[PDB]
Ligand binder design. Sequence first.
Ligand code: ZN
Length: 200
Amino acid sequence: KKKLILFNFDSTLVNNETIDEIAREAGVEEEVKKITNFEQSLRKRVSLLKDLPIEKVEKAIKRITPTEGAEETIKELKNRGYVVAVVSGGFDIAVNKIKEKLGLDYAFANRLIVKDGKLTGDVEGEVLKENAKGEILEKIAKIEGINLEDTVAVGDGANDISMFKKAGLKIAFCAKPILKEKADICIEKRDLREILKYIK
Ligand SMILES: [Zn+2]
C-alpha cells in the first residue's frame, strides 16, 4: 500500500519564496511586496522582471535553502513507503535542482520564459489556476495508482487549499492563518521532522 505526500515548495519545503528572491536581484522587491487571480497576480509580479539577465536569476535561486529537517524527513518518509513530491506556483529553474538534490520523486512548477539570456517578463505553467495544486495531487496519485485517501498534502497558504480538498490528510506547516483551521494537523515549529510524529 504505497502512499503519497505532496509538499508545497515556497516557504514550506524551502525557507524562501522564489519570486521574492528573484525580485530582490532586480531591485524591484518593494513593488512586488506592495501588491504582494493568484495567476493574474503571478503574471503581474513576473512582468516587473522585464529584462532580468538569466545570470541574475541563477544568482537569486542559489540562495534558496531547504527548510530545517527536509533531508531527514524525506528519508524517513520513503522508508515508510511514501512517494515524495513537491509542487510550486513558483518556477522550474529552481525546483528541479531541489528535486534532484533532495531526491524527490516528482516536481511540478511554472516556467520563467527566457530569451537570449534574459527574462521576457512572461510566465507559463500548469500550476496557475485556482485549483492547480489539487489537480497535480490527483495527477500523481493517478500515475502511481494511489488512492486519494492515502495521500498527504503539506501546505503554506491560500493556494494550497485546492490541494487540501483532494488530500486524505491535510497538514498546515507554519502556515498562514487562513490555512491552519482547515488542516487536520497544524505544525507551528519550523522543523519538517515534526510531521513524522503524525504520518502513518
Ligand atoms: Zn538542523
